[model samples]
Target: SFSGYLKLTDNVYIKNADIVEEAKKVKPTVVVNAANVYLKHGGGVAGALNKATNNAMQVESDDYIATNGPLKVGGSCVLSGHNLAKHCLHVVGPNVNKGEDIQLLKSAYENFNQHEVLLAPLLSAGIFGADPIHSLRVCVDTVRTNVYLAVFDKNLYDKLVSSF
Candidate 1:
């Protein structure tokens, strides 16, 4: 079940849950993965679709890179989520230490408009060195429709509930 629910609209809201498990739990929504510039999904939520799709997503990511080249921080990519999900939306977040702009994080969420229910993660947190709450704030304000936050960290989830 989802916890710390924050409803922005009748349908749009954010909830705390196991991000990857939510991918399996809900069969139709497009799950999001924080992708690298090269569209590589090796760890975090990024690497997850590989096991679910038997690395089909990995090669799909590779071929995507082969065609489009490196995905920038503001860029978002779409992938066939196989049978596990309808699609996978990959958004590249900023590495704060590199003095990257948070504005790019806004664009990272731009393409989310088309999806009905986006099971998304905190856009620029973790290795990107982004502040969790700030990342969530950007996501909350940017996505025009449903934005379910796929948060697994109890501590961070607590912070999110407090902030929102």
Candidate 2:
């Protein structure tokens, strides 16, 4: 069964569902993806977005990073011209095994405030290895605008739901 909205704030919300499914429902102005310094769309949320957007994310990310250089941790690259959303914000998060930086994750969420509706996954918690609970807490605490956190992993989603 679907655990409905887990409200973090008046605007911020958490939902147990696939990120892509949330994106489709919200049609958010911005959809954030956890990326590496290279901005390569490989696995996790980034890969899913790349597939959903028909590889446009790859082309945009490649071009954007090629011109601007690799994104630093806590840094972001905004790409438009995609059907998934008006813009896809790619944030370079800490490599989970290397050492996850909570501040950097917060900074990435801080980068985009203008967008009314934003959809994101549990940043750096999957492929990157950051703690999902910690990451989710930071995201909830950081984003000031309306944000939807999509949890794809059943266990993670259950934990989040139980927390509230």
Candidate 3:
């Protein structure tokens, strides 16, 4: 579960320290429900990482620009990450089954893409070492979802697209 503040519009004037304090105030409420707290920090992809490559890799950081700051509304949490062009969105769903239907996932991604809304697919199930196939399915599903594509494991992609 992820919990964070929602800051909208171009409010860069708001100091990062203020944002953190505001985030901290909500910690008890979020943590009481067991949620990973987040703050709407500035810096989009540039804030997510300091370096870039031809390909994207997952690197956990506290930096992420809030959604309403740069994107329009109507964003959903179920879509994959490959779709859309908004600043960012945070998701909290865990992988609940073996492999989610690719078509359903693809549909969600397509929906987001058509709307031009940025998406961020949350992957919490694999953290406990779920089946790689299931996890890989999530990645493939995300890519088809219209996400920019950020996967933690490079081999997973090779294994998925390839016959393994």
Candidate lDDT values, in order: 0.76, 0.77, 0.27
lDDT of 3 by residue, 40-83 (tens): 21233322321221112122222222432221111222211211
Error of 2 at 49 (Å): 0.6
Q: By TM-score, how accurate is candidate 2? A: 0.88
Compute each candidate's TM-score over C-alphas.
Answer: 0.87, 0.88, 0.30
Question: Tens digit of lDDT per residue, candidate 1, span 53-149?
Answer: 7888888889998988998888888888775578888878886867888778888877687787787888888777789888877776778877777
**Candidate 2 vs candidate 3, lDDT winner:** 2
The TM-score of candidate 3 is 0.30
Error (Å) of candidate 1 at residue 71 is 1.6
83-164: candidate 2 lDDT, tens digit per residue: 7777788877777577756668777777656666677776778888878888877777777777778888888888876874
Model 1 — which ten-residue stretch has the worst lDDT? Answer: 1-10
Clashes of 3: 5
Count residue pairs with overlapping backbones in model 2. 1
Indicate the residue-level lDDT of 85 in model 2. Answer: 71
lDDT of 1 at 61: 88
- Give every collision pair in model 2: 96-128
> What is the descending lDDT order?
2, 1, 3
